[PDB]
Design a protein around this ligand. Sequence first.
Ligand SMILES: COc1cc2c(cc1OC)-c1n[nH]c(-c3ccc(O)cc3)c1C2
Length: 265
Amino acid sequence: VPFVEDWDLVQTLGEGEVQLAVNRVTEEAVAVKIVNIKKEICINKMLNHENVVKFYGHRREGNIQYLFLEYCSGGELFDRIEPDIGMPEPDAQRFFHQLMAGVVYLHGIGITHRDIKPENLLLDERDNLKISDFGLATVFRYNNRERLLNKMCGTLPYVAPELLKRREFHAEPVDVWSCGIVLTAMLAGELPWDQPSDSCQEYSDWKEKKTYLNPWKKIDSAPLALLHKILVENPSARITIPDIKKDRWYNKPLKKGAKRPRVTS
Ligand SMILES: COc1cc2c(cc1OC)-c1n[nH]c(-c3ccc(O)cc3)c1C2
C-alpha cells in the first residue's frame, strides 16, 4: 500500500518539540517528538497500559530522533484545572483513579516516572488520563532487587521533601508525593508551595496542620484526609498505593459514567 508511511506535521503540541502528525493515507493522528533519549526509547519500548501514552516507534534521520507517540486529543490535565478553583471533585476523583492505575503499572514493572505533574498528564478523546514523558524515568527495581535513587530531578513544586534533604531515597514514595500535589492542584487550582522545605512558610503551615489556610480551605474534608496521608514528610510513614486504594474518599461514589444517548416514551 503506497504512502501509508507518510505523515504531515500539521501543528505544534509542545516545546525539542512535539508535533501533531497526520497520516497521508489513513488520516490517523499521532504525536511526533523531535529531539537521556536512548533511555527514553528503551523505557517506552517496555510500556503497554491504558493509562500510559502509547509508543508506536522511533526513527533517526541523521542527528534528529523522531519518536512516534500517542496523540491525546483531550490535551493536558493542566488545561482542565481552573486557576484558584480546580475542577469538580468527581472529575478529579476519576482522574486520580486513572493516575493510580498508571503509576501502579509503572511501579509493578519497576519504572519510576520522576516528573509527574498536570503538564505531563494527557487526556484521550474519552478524557482517559495517560501518563507521558519518560525522559526523566528510570528503572528502580531489576531482578526483584530495589535500587535507591540519589539523582535530583522533577519539578520543585511537585518534588518530595526527601529529594531535598536526603542523599538516597526510595523511588515509589517520590511518585506518590507528586500524585498528591497533582490531586491538590485538581481540587484547589493552585500549588501549595514552591518547594517542600522548612524555609517555605506554606510548607511549614501544612506540617503545623493549618488547614484553615489555602489551598486546604477549598478542599473537602474527605479528599483532604487522603492528602494528609500522602503529603507526609517521612517517606517511610507516607501512604502507599495499596493503602490509597483503601481510602474512604478514593472509594466514595461521586461520578456518573459518561452520559449515554437516551430517548423517552
Ligand atoms: C497543548 O495541547 C496539547 C498538548 C499535547 C497533546 C495534545 C494537545 O492538545 C490536544 C498531545 N498528544 N500527545 C502528546 C505527547 C505524547 C508523548 C509525549 O512524550 C509528549 C507529548 C501531546 C502534547
